[PDB]
Every structure is written in structure tokens, then in C-alpha cells.
Amino acid sequence: ADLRRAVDTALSNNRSLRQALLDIEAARAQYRIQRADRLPSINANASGNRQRLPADLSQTGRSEVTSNYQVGLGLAEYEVDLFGRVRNLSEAALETYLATEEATRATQISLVAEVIQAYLTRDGALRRMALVEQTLDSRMASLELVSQRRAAGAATALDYQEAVGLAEQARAERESTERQLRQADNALVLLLGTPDAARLLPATPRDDLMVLQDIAPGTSSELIERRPDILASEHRLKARNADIGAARAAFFPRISLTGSVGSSSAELSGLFDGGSRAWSFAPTLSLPIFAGGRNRANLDLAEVRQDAAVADYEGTIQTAFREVADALAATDTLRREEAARQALAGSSEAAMALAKARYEGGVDDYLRYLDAQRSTFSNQTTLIQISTERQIALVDLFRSLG
Amino acid sequence: ADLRRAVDTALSNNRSLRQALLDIEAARAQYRIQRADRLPSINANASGNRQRLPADLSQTGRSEVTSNYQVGLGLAEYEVDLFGRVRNLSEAALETYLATEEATRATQISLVAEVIQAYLTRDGALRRMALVEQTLDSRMASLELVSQRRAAGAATALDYQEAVGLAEQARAERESTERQLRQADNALVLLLGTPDAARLLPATPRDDLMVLQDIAPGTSSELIERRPDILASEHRLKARNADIGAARAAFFPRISLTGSVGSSSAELSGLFDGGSRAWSFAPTLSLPIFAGGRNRANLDLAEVRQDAAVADYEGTIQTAFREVADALAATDTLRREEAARQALAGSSEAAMALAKARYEGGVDDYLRYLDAQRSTFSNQTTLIQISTERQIALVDLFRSLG
Amino acid sequence: ADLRRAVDTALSNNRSLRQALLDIEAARAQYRIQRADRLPSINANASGNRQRLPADLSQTGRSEVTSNYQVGLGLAEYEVDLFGRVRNLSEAALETYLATEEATRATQISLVAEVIQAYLTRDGALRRMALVEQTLDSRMASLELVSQRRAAGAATALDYQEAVGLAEQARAERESTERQLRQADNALVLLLGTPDAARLLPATPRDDLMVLQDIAPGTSSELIERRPDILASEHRLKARNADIGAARAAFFPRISLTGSVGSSSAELSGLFDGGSRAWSFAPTLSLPIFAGGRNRANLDLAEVRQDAAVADYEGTIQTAFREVADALAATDTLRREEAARQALAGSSEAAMALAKARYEGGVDDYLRYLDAQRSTFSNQTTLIQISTERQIALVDLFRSLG
Hints:
The structure is cut from a larger assembly and holds three copies of chain A.
Chain A: H1 2-13, H2 15-36, E1 42-52, E2 66-80, H3 85-151, H4 157-192, H5 220-226, H6 228-249, E3 254-265, E4 277-287, H7 296-360, H8 366-400
Antiparallel strand pairs in A: 1-2, 2-3, 3-4
Helix pairs in contact in A: 1-3, 2-3, 3-4, 3-6, 3-8, 6-7, 7-8
């Protein structure tokens, strides 16, 4: 239940997710840039040229000095287009924007998966912490008992030394578990993206279900149709298929329309006088007759780039298939391994019960009961690593399934 | 023997290899693009300009409207070149294409080596599987015997619990080995690039030699001249050296010949009438007298980029040296370690013979024979990891040597 | 003491550091490129246009052939800038150069820390080598003693086999540690960047202090103000803020002054005769009245890019915070773990002393003394891995603190 709140908080506040959502807007703006090219551009132009072959003659100087002044609206090289290369560029930009949106969705799912993995690791670490703490308590109890026994002369110094060594060995394990727990907490605080993240997480471990234990993978086609990474690859392939059309349109003639409307005069004073309203119109037709490879090798570049995009799409499909196969195998194998470790923990607990019953009857010493404690507790914490790994494998399955 | 067939199949069908081979064609097409620039560009141009200072007057309107219409062939800004900057760009593109070819060769080698490594991992996993299966059988035999002994009262419940725990521990090892084997199979099917890869692999392990056990590394100079990544780095350095000449030629004057031949008239009706065949020739000589840093800082950019290219060449050489030295050290050390594990396995088998002889004589119980079975088999599988690591190290040495 | 010398040698000779220092010069050159745009550009221009409406007429042909030949100086489209978009791009290039300098500093620190870590790993490996060598010696002593005992019939063949197995196991550990030591030496020779690196290191490990043991992290704001990668991120954000100004200035009108001074004549012979000194001056005003999204969506692109840069800055801050937290936790935890392992080593040494005292008195056999040797030595080296990891964690803390 806390996972949904964590996911909502990440969606609200995560920084890389904000980066991806803004990249969506960036791709949208670039698509708008390319789409705006499809409409004619009109520009207000004010120009004045002053030229003469003799020298000096400035500010109404004494010569044949020519001056022209053109102010008005102008249609600047409107490409009237038989194929719509601009349209193909707009299509490529739109496909790029769609791919960016799909990549943002994939980043969102990846962030969710990372967060839940960190949470599961933290829970396992908390369980391990309680486990090793009580284990160290058991070790210290055994050390105290052995020290008291040698003080009475019933034990050699070798036994005291071995007890000390066992206690120190357990202490190192406790330190390692502390380091693991602190690193997990730091990873969670990094993932959540807020300085108050440590306040939003529960402080103690819980035995409740966190994520669904059994997931049906369905068919490979369903994985293909739902995973955002494959969708981004397909959209990128489509953008490349637009680029091939652009390079193909590069071959055909383009018609360009240059026009103007405004005023013209040889002197500034007559710039706004009656009868100065002028205009112009031109339709030029551009077609390199012989590319010499200049436009042909552009076609081969486009074709080869589209081929590389197709191969990238196939490779991403193969990577997705590998990921889902690995995740399914891990899920099944870790489920069975967790069953095995659960059986081991139950056997150790039964051994504890028998040792406790023997000791309370005065037949076995305190050392046997304490050692049973240590053994069953070590097995119970060893179960926890397998359980946490199974949960992380389930999360990896969920991610790799899209 | 199967390895050569796998290599041929990968060359025929691998997707990243197809990407690299297509990138070869892309670099070739780009080289053709840049080489086409060295030849004159002649384009067919048709233009019509209609302009006048008063307004209205459309479609032969009543004024001094000037209309000109020019249709013909035109040499569009042929840069006749005193230094051949275009030639330097063509050389840079050719060097880039050569570097792309070398990178494709390196990708081929990498894919091949990954294939052998995954295959060897699968073989080792199969051996480990047979091992742990029979080990688990041994554990069940011991558990059954201990259960039968407690049923008769000759064994305590503690012994039954320890037998159960050992059997459960062995089950976990079997599950881990199953996960490893399945992951190796998935890796192989990913690498081979075919859904029927699981049919192209033999289902059982073999003791036959797969790759040459003793390889002479030769000298480091031979490694430099044969490893494709160093060659790709050298070709990239050469392309940088060509871009140096490009930026250097950016300083010198360029001569640009614009030309045209076609028709021109004040009215459209006379466009194809006699006496309108016009021509034009215009050479321009371009040389910024004072760059102000505009052409100079380009020169510094080129020189500094060349220095960085030399540095990357040296770094790649150092990385290759590190890789080959590590591979040699690993080969020798894992050879000696495998010898050690072979000795351990032989000692365990001798203990097998002795324990079996003792048990068949009725001196030792079935537990001793079964425990010895477990021990010798655990040693035999522990040898297998070292052997597989040595084989993978040999494959890595092959990859590193080109 | 040797560490500062190693750092100095790396600064003098490292290749990636040379790459970064040269990238500083490259960024400086690009900044000079973009800054030189702020000044007017003058270019020597010589052109000759020969055109006429009929055909033939080459080399003073018989027609109305028009020839003009202009040689002189020309101010080519010098942009008079209302907003200084040129200034904004120069500022963006300057910020990029500053970011490159900071990134070079960060690369310097990273290379230093890598060198220190490799050196510490080599020291630990040397200690482990002496350790495992004497441990193997102990194993062979035990094997010889057990073989001599079986020759006399006082020991079974099973005991000889277990002794052989233990000796072979120890040999494998020796081989593994040899591989580790050789790989560490290879890493050092790669990092130092000189073929004579193996002559600059001590052949025997030392117990002296190498790096300071206690470091105060200070406050997070201090980490924000000193770590070079955060500085590079901030500088990149500033460069993005400058490109914001460039895209904003793209909206406003641009004045463009074109000018010329030189000679002009209808025939070549009069190119340098008196009375031909011509000049030209033109100030054009360019302002698209309706962007149509062409300039607006550029503004959106710039704003969204600036937002993405801000998010990148925040994410880099979070990454640095995570790194310093991990480093502090590791420092403390490995300090306490090293204390625990030191206590274990001391206990094992005391057990050694007691076992030697017993054996010299003729109470315990040689096997017990040899086993005490093996145990105390294994524990003493098990301390060494923790010590080396603590040193490496200190180095990581130094790197992550800038």
C-alpha cells in the first residue's frame, strides 16, 4: 500500500522524471519548429544602398551617386513544393517527439522499479539487522559463560580464546550488516528526491505482502506491444523512415517564390509620397541535372540509415526477449529456493525447540541451547537474502514486462 | 568444430554485426558524398522576375513593368581551389570510412568472443548440473537412512534434523545451478540471434578441447599492428590530421567560378527565339585580410583537436597493453589453479576408493561412504568453475589479441 | 610521502589528463571563435562579371558584351546588433570553457584517486602474498609430517589424503593471490602511464600511514561550493541560460551594415586608373513580423532546455549527496570492522602463543601447533582485506568531497 504513495511522490517530485517530462516539451517544441516551416514566411525588410564609382561625395556629394531604399513586406523564398520535403521533415520531428514521450514513459517505469527495489532491500536489511543483533547477543552470552567457567578453572585458555574469536567474528558481521542498511537508506533517500525522504519511510520491517507474488507473462507478442523501450525504438525507426523520404525528395525540383510589396525611391524624401507603391513576384525552379553522387549518395546514406534503424529495432526486440526470459527463470528458481530455505529455517527452529526442552530438563548445558540459537538465527537471516532477491527479481520482471 | 559453424551462422545472421556492416556502407556513402564535392556542380536554372515601382499592372498591366525570364544551364559556384580543401575533406571522409571498417571488424571479433564465452559457460553449467543432481541424490540417500535409523530408535531427532538441513541446503545449491544454466542458455540464444539457437546447441557436455590451450602472445608491437581497435584509433587520428589541413586551407583565398549559358528576354514569347543565347562567367577571389581570430581560432581548434587525437591514440595503446597483460596473467594463474583443483579431485577420488573398500568390507557404515561421495563430488564441481574460468580467459586472450 | 610523488608524476605524464588539459585549450579556442564575431569583419574582394545576351563573343567579341571588374575591400554583412546575440553566444562559449576547465579539474582529481586506490590495493596484495606463502609452508610441513606418520603405520591413508587435499587447497589460494597481485601491478602500470612505473613502486609492503584517517565532511552547502563536478554542472546551466538569451534575441530586429571600397571599370585596362575609387554603404533591418512559431517555438525550446539544465543541476547535487553519505558510512563502518578484525587477529596470536608453549613442553603434537599457525595466519590476512578496503573507502571519500 505504501508503494503507491511512494510512486505518486516520485511522480510529483523526481528530478530525472522532470527531465524526461521536459524533454517531451522540448521534442514538442522542435516538432512545432519543423511544422511551422510548412507555412510561408513573411518578413518586413528595410534596406538602403548607396553606391558610386568616384570617391568622396558623401551626404548629397557632387556626383552621379545612386541610392535606393526599399521598405516593405516580402515573401522570402516560399518553397512551393511538389513533394512536401518540409512535410517529411515535420513527420520526422513528430515521430521523434512520440519517441521522446515513450522514452519518458520508460524512464518513469524504470524510476518506479528502482524505488520499489530499494524499499524491498531496506526491508530485508532491517530484518537482517534484528537478526544479527540478537545473534551478537547470543555470542556475548556464550563468551560471558565461557569466561566465568575458565575463572573457575573448568576451561582452558584455548576455549576462552575461541569464544572471543567467535564473538569478534559475529561483531564483524554486525558491522557489515550496518553498512548495508545505511547504504540502502542512502539509496532510498537518493531515489525519492526530497530532503525529508527519511521521514516518509517506515522504520521497522513488516511481514505483509508488498508486490504481487505470481505474474503471468503471457505471450511474447504481448510483451512486444506494451514495453515502452520497444515502442521508442519503433518510433525512432519510423523517424528514420521519414528521413529516407526527405533524402528522396532531395532529388526533385523545388519551386521557390520570392516577392515583395512596399516603396521605392532614388531619394529618401520621396519614400512615402504618392505613387511609390511597388511590388515584385518571382518563381524560380531548382533542379541539379547531374548529382555526380551528391544527391545519389544522399539516397544511399538514407537507405543505409534506415537499414541500421531496422537492425536496431530487431536488436532491441532480442534484448527485451532476453530480459523477460531471465526474469521468468529468476522468479521460478528463487521461489523454489525460498521454499528450500524456509524448510531449512523450520528444521532449525525444531532443533531449537528440542535443545530448549533438553536444557530446561537439566540434561544439556547452556552452551548447546545458545549454539542452537545461533544456528537457527543464522539460517533465518539466510532465508531473508533469498526472499529479498526474489522480490527484486519480481520487480525486475515487472520492469522488463513494461 | 561446432564453434566454426556457430561463427559462420553469427556472421550470416547476427544483428549488431549487420549494424556494423551497414555502418561500413554508411561511411562509404558519406565518403562518396564528400568526394563528389571535388567535381564541378552544374545545375539547370529557370527563373522569372517581374518588378515595377507603381501598383496594379498585373498580366501585361499598363506601366513600365519589367519582366525577365532566364532558362538554361549554370555552373553554380565552382570553387576552383588553390589548396584543395575539398580534397582534404574527402581524405578525412575516407579515413573515417576506413575507421568504420576497422570498428566493424572489432565488433565482429567481440561478438565472436562473446559467443565462445557463453558456449563454454553453458558447457560448464551442464557439468555442474549433472554433478549437483547426483550430489542431491546422495543427500536424499543419507536423509532416508537417518530417518530409518531414528524410526528404530538408534538415532536422535537431532540427527534427523541435521540430515534434513543438509538435504535442504543441497536443494538450494541445485536450484542456484539451475538458475545459472537457464541464464546461460538465454545468453546463448540472445547472442546467436536466432529463435532456434536451442536446437543448434548440443544438449550434453563434452570433454573435447574447444579452443587452443597454449597461445603465444608474441611482442606488443605485433599486438599493436593486429588489434582492430588500435587500428580504428589510428585511422581516427589520421582523419583528425586531415581536418587539420581543412582548417589550414580555410586561411587561403578561394576562387569561385559562377557561370551560365541559356536564354533571356524581356518577354516570354521570345524565350526560344533566335538571338537570346546568353552566357555569364564570374570568378571571385575570397581572402579575409584580417581574421581577427575568426580563421586563426579555427586553426587553434584544429591543432588542439590533433593533440587530443594523439593523446587518445596513446591511451588506446595503453588500454590494449593493460588488457593483454591481464589476459596473460589470468591464463597462467588459472592454468596452475586448475592443476591444483585436478590434484584435489584426484585425492578425493582416492578417498572414494578407500571408503568404498572399507564399506564393502563391513567395517564402515553407509553414512561414511555417502559423505565421502558428497565430498568428492563437491570437489569435482568446484574444479569445474576454475576450468570454465580458464577457458573464458583463453577466449578473452584471443579477443584481446585481435 | 611517496603518494605526493606519484600524484606529481601523474600530473606530469598522464594521458587522459593531457586530453582534459587540451580540451581546456579547445574550449578556449571556441570561446575565441565566438568572441571574435563581436567585431566587424572586413575582407578583400576581387570579382569580375562578364555577361551578354547573344552567343560567342569571347575575348572582346563583336557585341554589346558587358564586363565589369571590381577589386577592393568589403565589409561583408557586419551585423549591427541591437541585442548582442553575438555577445550572448560569446558568453555561452565562455561558460562552456569554464565548465571544461572545471571538468578537467574533476578528471585530475579522479585520476589521482584512482592512482591512490591502486597503490593501496598493491600494498594489501603484497601483505596477502607474504601471508599465503607462509601459510602454504605450514601446509607442506603438515603434509610431510603426516606422510612420515603413515610411513610408520601410525596414520591411516585417509589422514594422508586429507592432508594432501588441504595442501592442494592452499596452493589454489596462493595462485589466486598471485593473480590478484599481478592484476594490481598491471592496474598501477596502466594508471601511471609510463613503462618504468614498476621501478617507482616499493617492492615490499609498509605499515606506515598513507592517507589521512579522519576527515570532517562539513555541511552540504560546503560540498555544493567545492566539488568540481557540481561546478561543471553549474557552469553548463549558466551556458544554457546564455543560449536562452541568444534564442530570445532571435526575436528582435537585426541591423546589417554592408560596405565596400575599391575600383570599378567596364574594361580591365582601366582597373587602376584615376577616378575609379568606389564605395558602398547599406544598413538593412531584419524583423520577421510573424514568426508563425518559427521564432516562438525556438523560444520554447530554449526555455525547456533551461528547465532541463536546472533539473540536471539538482540531480547532480543529489548524486554528490548520495556519494558523500555512502563514503561517510563506509568510513565509520569499516573503521569499526577493522577494530573487530584486529581483535580477532590478537586472539588468534594469543592462541598461537599458548599452543607453542604447550608444544615446546611436549604435551601437544606438532599438528596442533601447525594448525594454530594456519588459523592465526589466515585471520591476520583476513584483517588485511578489511584494512585495504578501509583505505580505498577513505580515498573514495576524498574524491567525492572534491
